[PDB]
Amino acid sequence: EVIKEFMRFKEHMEGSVNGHEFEIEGEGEGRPYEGTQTARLKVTKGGPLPFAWDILSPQISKAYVKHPADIPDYLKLSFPEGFKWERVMNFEDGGVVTVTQDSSLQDGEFIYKVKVRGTNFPSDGPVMQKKTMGWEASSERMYPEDGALKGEMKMRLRLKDGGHYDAEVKTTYMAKKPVQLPGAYKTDIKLDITSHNEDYTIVEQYERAEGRHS
């Protein structure tokens, strides 16, 4: 099995949000079959970012999702060649983020290259004013469509006040080879920011994700 019980990953991310270009580098580790992983990220160009780290955190690793034997693990199956994914997040206040990502396995570690583009975030909104406080746990509705695996969910960002700031999220995951698509199911995901410096140029995150029948 190319996917071992413990796998590391290296990530490079670049993009722009509201005219602000940046680049991030990261390294992480986890247990793919247990659906858990952690990573250390740092802003290498464009820091400090003028917008919430939270909009980038979900873009920073689906080979780490625990699946029951009866649900084909399409994304793990795609390795070592890997898969690509594209996503759109439509925030309740008009903000939008689109992402394109490439994932592969080289010399025993996962390699991720991400491009993130955010725009139309109000200057006085929670994103640009950095008033968000991490994500509530999410449940992604997964289903095969058009020979791809799709995921859809409404994600909720906690607000400094106490409210929430929502986004409707749509993602298409496409294996590089036609490995077995699963039937419809759900993936429960919880992402936490476990550490960060004050201006978020240095950040760590943890994520647990698990697929189950719907």
Short mmCIF file of all heavy atoms in Angstrom, two decimals, residues 37-75, unseen atoms left out:
data_model
loop_
_atom_site.label_atom_id
_atom_site.label_comp_id
_atom_site.label_asym_id
_atom_site.label_seq_id
_atom_site.Cartn_x
_atom_site.Cartn_y
_atom_site.Cartn_z
N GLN A 37 -4.90 14.52 11.39
CA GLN A 37 -3.66 15.09 10.89
C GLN A 37 -3.41 16.43 11.56
O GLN A 37 -4.33 17.07 12.05
CB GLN A 37 -3.79 15.31 9.40
CG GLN A 37 -4.92 16.32 9.03
CD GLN A 37 -5.13 16.39 7.50
OE1 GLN A 37 -4.18 16.68 6.76
NE2 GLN A 37 -6.34 16.08 7.03
N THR A 38 -2.15 16.84 11.58
CA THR A 38 -1.76 18.15 12.10
C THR A 38 -0.75 18.73 11.09
O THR A 38 -0.15 18.00 10.29
CB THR A 38 -0.97 18.06 13.44
OG1 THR A 38 0.17 17.21 13.27
CG2 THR A 38 -1.86 17.60 14.60
N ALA A 39 -0.59 20.05 11.12
CA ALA A 39 0.34 20.73 10.22
C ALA A 39 0.83 22.04 10.84
O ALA A 39 0.13 22.69 11.66
CB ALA A 39 -0.31 21.03 8.88
N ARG A 40 2.02 22.43 10.38
CA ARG A 40 2.69 23.68 10.77
C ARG A 40 2.75 24.52 9.50
O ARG A 40 3.31 24.07 8.49
CB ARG A 40 4.12 23.35 11.25
CG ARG A 40 4.19 23.08 12.72
CD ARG A 40 3.43 21.80 13.06
NE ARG A 40 3.87 20.65 12.26
CZ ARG A 40 3.33 19.43 12.31
NH1 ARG A 40 2.28 19.17 13.10
NH2 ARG A 40 3.79 18.47 11.52
N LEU A 41 2.15 25.70 9.52
CA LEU A 41 2.13 26.58 8.33
C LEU A 41 2.84 27.90 8.66
O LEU A 41 2.93 28.32 9.81
CB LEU A 41 0.69 26.94 7.87
CG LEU A 41 -0.36 25.85 7.60
CD1 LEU A 41 0.29 24.78 6.74
CD2 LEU A 41 -0.88 25.22 8.89
N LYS A 42 3.30 28.58 7.63
CA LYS A 42 3.91 29.89 7.83
C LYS A 42 3.73 30.67 6.54
O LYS A 42 3.79 30.08 5.44
CB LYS A 42 5.36 29.77 8.25
CG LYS A 42 6.26 29.26 7.19
CD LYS A 42 7.68 29.08 7.74
CE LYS A 42 8.56 28.26 6.78
NZ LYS A 42 10.00 28.27 7.18
N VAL A 43 3.44 31.96 6.68
CA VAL A 43 3.23 32.84 5.54
C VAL A 43 4.61 33.22 5.06
O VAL A 43 5.39 33.77 5.83
CB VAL A 43 2.47 34.14 5.94
CG1 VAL A 43 2.45 35.09 4.73
CG2 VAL A 43 1.02 33.80 6.44
N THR A 44 4.95 32.87 3.83
CA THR A 44 6.31 33.13 3.32
C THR A 44 6.41 34.33 2.38
O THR A 44 7.50 34.78 2.06
CB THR A 44 6.83 31.91 2.60
OG1 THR A 44 5.89 31.56 1.60
CG2 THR A 44 6.95 30.72 3.58
N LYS A 45 5.35 34.82 1.89
CA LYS A 45 5.29 36.03 1.10
C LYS A 45 3.98 36.78 1.32
O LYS A 45 2.93 36.07 1.51
CB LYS A 45 5.47 35.71 -0.39
N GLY A 46 3.94 38.05 1.49
CA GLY A 46 2.70 38.77 1.71
C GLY A 46 2.23 38.92 3.14
O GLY A 46 1.16 39.44 3.40
N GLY A 47 3.02 38.45 4.09
CA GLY A 47 2.60 38.55 5.46
C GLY A 47 2.99 39.91 6.00
O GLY A 47 3.97 40.51 5.55
N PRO A 48 2.22 40.41 6.96
CA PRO A 48 1.09 39.68 7.53
C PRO A 48 -0.16 39.83 6.68
O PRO A 48 -0.33 40.84 6.00
CB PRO A 48 0.91 40.36 8.89
CG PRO A 48 1.37 41.75 8.66
CD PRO A 48 2.36 41.75 7.54
N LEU A 49 -1.00 38.80 6.66
CA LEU A 49 -2.22 38.84 5.84
C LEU A 49 -3.25 39.79 6.46
O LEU A 49 -3.47 39.79 7.67
CB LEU A 49 -2.84 37.44 5.66
CG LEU A 49 -1.90 36.32 5.26
CD1 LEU A 49 -2.62 35.01 5.23
CD2 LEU A 49 -1.30 36.62 3.90
N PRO A 50 -3.91 40.56 5.61
CA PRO A 50 -4.91 41.49 6.10
C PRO A 50 -6.30 40.88 6.24
O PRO A 50 -7.29 41.60 6.40
CB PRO A 50 -4.91 42.58 5.01
CG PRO A 50 -4.53 41.84 3.77
CD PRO A 50 -3.54 40.81 4.21
N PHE A 51 -6.41 39.56 6.16
CA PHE A 51 -7.73 38.93 6.25
C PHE A 51 -7.66 37.73 7.18
O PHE A 51 -6.57 37.31 7.53
CB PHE A 51 -8.18 38.50 4.87
CG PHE A 51 -7.21 37.63 4.16
CD1 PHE A 51 -7.24 36.25 4.32
CD2 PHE A 51 -6.29 38.18 3.28
CE1 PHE A 51 -6.35 35.45 3.64
CE2 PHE A 51 -5.38 37.37 2.60
CZ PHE A 51 -5.39 36.01 2.80
N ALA A 52 -8.81 37.18 7.59
CA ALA A 52 -8.84 36.04 8.53
C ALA A 52 -8.12 34.77 8.07
O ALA A 52 -8.36 34.27 6.99
CB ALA A 52 -10.27 35.68 8.97
N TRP A 53 -7.27 34.22 8.93
CA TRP A 53 -6.62 32.96 8.58
C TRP A 53 -7.74 31.92 8.31
O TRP A 53 -7.57 30.98 7.52
CB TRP A 53 -5.78 32.45 9.77
CG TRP A 53 -5.18 31.07 9.50
CD1 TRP A 53 -5.69 29.83 9.89
CD2 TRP A 53 -4.02 30.79 8.71
NE1 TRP A 53 -4.90 28.81 9.36
CE2 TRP A 53 -3.87 29.39 8.66
CE3 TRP A 53 -3.09 31.59 8.07
CZ2 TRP A 53 -2.82 28.79 7.98
CZ3 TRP A 53 -2.04 31.01 7.44
CH2 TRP A 53 -1.92 29.62 7.38
N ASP A 54 -8.88 32.03 9.01
CA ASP A 54 -9.93 31.01 8.88
C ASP A 54 -10.43 30.71 7.48
O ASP A 54 -10.94 29.62 7.22
CB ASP A 54 -11.13 31.28 9.81
CG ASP A 54 -10.78 31.22 11.32
OD1 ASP A 54 -9.96 30.36 11.73
OD2 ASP A 54 -11.42 32.01 12.10
N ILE A 55 -10.31 31.66 6.55
CA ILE A 55 -10.84 31.35 5.23
C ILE A 55 -9.86 30.45 4.47
O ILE A 55 -10.25 29.81 3.49
CB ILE A 55 -11.27 32.61 4.38
CG1 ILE A 55 -10.06 33.49 4.01
CG2 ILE A 55 -12.28 33.50 5.16
CD1 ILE A 55 -10.32 34.48 2.84
N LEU A 56 -8.61 30.42 4.92
CA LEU A 56 -7.59 29.58 4.26
C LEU A 56 -7.47 28.19 4.86
O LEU A 56 -7.03 27.25 4.18
CB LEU A 56 -6.22 30.25 4.40
CG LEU A 56 -6.12 31.66 3.77
CD1 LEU A 56 -4.69 32.19 3.77
CD2 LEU A 56 -6.72 31.68 2.34
N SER A 57 -7.83 28.06 6.15
CA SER A 57 -7.64 26.80 6.86
C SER A 57 -8.25 25.54 6.21
O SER A 57 -7.63 24.49 6.21
CB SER A 57 -7.94 26.95 8.36
OG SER A 57 -9.33 27.14 8.58
N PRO A 58 -9.44 25.66 5.64
CA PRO A 58 -10.06 24.50 5.00
C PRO A 58 -9.40 24.14 3.71
O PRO A 58 -9.61 23.04 3.21
CB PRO A 58 -11.49 24.94 4.74
CG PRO A 58 -11.71 26.04 5.74
CD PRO A 58 -10.39 26.77 5.71
N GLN A 59 -8.61 25.05 3.15
CA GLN A 59 -7.93 24.74 1.88
C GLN A 59 -6.60 24.05 2.16
O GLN A 59 -6.04 23.35 1.30
CB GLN A 59 -7.68 25.98 1.03
CG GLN A 59 -8.67 27.18 1.20
CD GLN A 59 -10.10 26.76 1.17
OE1 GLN A 59 -10.43 25.70 0.63
NE2 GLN A 59 -10.94 27.53 1.82
N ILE A 60 -6.07 24.26 3.36
CA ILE A 60 -4.78 23.70 3.72
C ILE A 60 -5.02 22.24 3.90
O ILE A 60 -4.23 21.27 3.64
CB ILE A 60 -4.28 24.27 5.06
CG1 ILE A 60 -3.98 25.77 4.95
CG2 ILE A 60 -3.11 23.45 5.58
CD1 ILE A 60 -2.91 26.08 3.92
N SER A 61 -7.07 18.14 2.63
CA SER A 61 -6.08 17.07 2.75
C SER A 61 -6.92 15.82 3.02
O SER A 61 -6.86 15.19 4.10
CB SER A 61 -5.15 17.45 3.92
OG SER A 61 -4.22 16.43 4.18
N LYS A 62 -7.71 15.48 2.01
CA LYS A 62 -8.68 14.38 2.07
C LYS A 62 -8.20 12.96 2.02
O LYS A 62 -9.00 12.02 2.10
CB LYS A 62 -9.80 14.59 1.05
CG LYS A 62 -10.55 15.89 1.22
CD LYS A 62 -11.46 15.82 2.38
CE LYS A 62 -12.81 16.26 1.93
NZ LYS A 62 -13.59 16.71 3.06
N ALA A 63 -6.90 12.77 1.91
CA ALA A 63 -6.44 11.39 1.98
C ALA A 63 -6.53 11.03 3.47
O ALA A 63 -6.45 9.87 3.82
CB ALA A 63 -4.97 11.27 1.52
N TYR A 64 -6.70 12.02 4.35
CA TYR A 64 -6.81 11.70 5.81
C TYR A 64 -8.25 11.76 6.27
O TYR A 64 -8.65 12.68 7.02
CB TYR A 64 -5.96 12.62 6.72
CG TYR A 64 -4.47 12.65 6.44
CD1 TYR A 64 -3.97 13.37 5.35
CD2 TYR A 64 -3.57 12.01 7.28
CE1 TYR A 64 -2.60 13.42 5.07
CE2 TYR A 64 -2.17 12.08 7.04
CZ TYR A 64 -1.70 12.78 5.93
OH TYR A 64 -0.36 12.88 5.64
N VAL A 65 -9.03 10.77 5.85
CA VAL A 65 -10.43 10.69 6.27
C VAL A 65 -10.67 9.22 6.54
O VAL A 65 -10.40 8.35 5.68
CB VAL A 65 -11.41 11.15 5.15
CG1 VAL A 65 -12.82 10.86 5.58
CG2 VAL A 65 -11.24 12.64 4.82
N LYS A 66 -11.15 8.91 7.73
CA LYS A 66 -11.40 7.49 8.08
C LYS A 66 -12.67 7.05 7.37
O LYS A 66 -13.72 7.71 7.48
CB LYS A 66 -11.55 7.35 9.61
CG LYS A 66 -11.94 5.96 10.09
CD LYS A 66 -12.02 5.90 11.65
CE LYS A 66 -12.29 4.42 12.10
NZ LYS A 66 -11.12 3.75 12.74
N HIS A 67 -12.58 5.90 6.68
CA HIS A 67 -13.71 5.35 5.93
C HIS A 67 -13.95 3.92 6.36
O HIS A 67 -13.01 3.15 6.54
CB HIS A 67 -13.38 5.32 4.38
CG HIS A 67 -13.55 6.63 3.69
ND1 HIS A 67 -12.59 7.63 3.73
CD2 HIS A 67 -14.58 7.13 2.95
CE1 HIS A 67 -13.03 8.68 3.06
NE2 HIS A 67 -14.23 8.41 2.58
N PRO A 68 -15.21 3.55 6.45
CA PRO A 68 -15.54 2.14 6.75
C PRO A 68 -15.22 1.35 5.49
O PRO A 68 -15.29 1.88 4.36
CB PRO A 68 -17.06 2.17 6.99
CG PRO A 68 -17.56 3.48 6.49
CD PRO A 68 -16.39 4.43 6.33
N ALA A 69 -14.86 0.10 5.66
CA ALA A 69 -14.52 -0.78 4.53
C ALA A 69 -15.55 -0.81 3.43
O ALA A 69 -15.20 -1.04 2.29
CB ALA A 69 -14.24 -2.19 5.00
N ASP A 70 -16.81 -0.57 3.78
CA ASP A 70 -17.88 -0.60 2.79
C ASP A 70 -18.08 0.65 1.96
O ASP A 70 -18.93 0.66 1.09
CB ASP A 70 -19.19 -1.14 3.35
CG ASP A 70 -19.90 -0.16 4.27
OD1 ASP A 70 -19.24 0.62 4.98
OD2 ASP A 70 -21.14 -0.21 4.32
N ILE A 71 -17.32 1.70 2.23
CA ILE A 71 -17.45 2.91 1.41
C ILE A 71 -16.12 3.08 0.69
O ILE A 71 -15.08 3.31 1.34
CB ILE A 71 -17.75 4.17 2.28
CG1 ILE A 71 -19.09 4.00 3.04
CG2 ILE A 71 -17.75 5.41 1.38
CD1 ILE A 71 -19.59 5.23 3.87
N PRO A 72 -16.12 2.94 -0.64
CA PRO A 72 -14.86 3.03 -1.38
C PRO A 72 -14.11 4.34 -1.01
O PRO A 72 -14.71 5.41 -0.97
CB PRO A 72 -15.31 3.02 -2.84
CG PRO A 72 -16.58 2.19 -2.81
CD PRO A 72 -17.26 2.53 -1.48
N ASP A 73 -12.81 4.25 -0.68
CA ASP A 73 -12.06 5.47 -0.28
C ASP A 73 -11.36 6.06 -1.50
O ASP A 73 -10.11 6.01 -1.67
CB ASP A 73 -11.06 5.14 0.84
CG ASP A 73 -10.64 6.37 1.61
OD1 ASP A 73 -10.59 7.46 1.03
OD2 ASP A 73 -10.36 6.21 2.80
N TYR A 74 -12.23 6.56 -2.40
CA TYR A 74 -11.86 7.11 -3.69
C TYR A 74 -10.58 7.94 -3.66
O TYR A 74 -9.67 7.74 -4.48
CB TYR A 74 -13.05 7.90 -4.23
CG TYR A 74 -12.86 8.64 -5.56
CD1 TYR A 74 -12.87 7.95 -6.80
CD2 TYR A 74 -12.75 10.04 -5.58
CE1 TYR A 74 -12.76 8.64 -8.03
CE2 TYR A 74 -12.69 10.74 -6.80
CZ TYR A 74 -12.68 10.03 -8.01
OH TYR A 74 -12.55 10.75 -9.19
N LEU A 75 -10.49 8.86 -2.70
CA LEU A 75 -9.30 9.70 -2.64
C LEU A 75 -8.01 9.00 -2.23
O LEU A 75 -6.94 9.27 -2.82
CB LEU A 75 -9.56 11.05 -2.01
CG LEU A 75 -10.81 11.76 -2.52
CD1 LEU A 75 -11.03 12.99 -1.67
CD2 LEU A 75 -10.67 12.17 -4.00
#
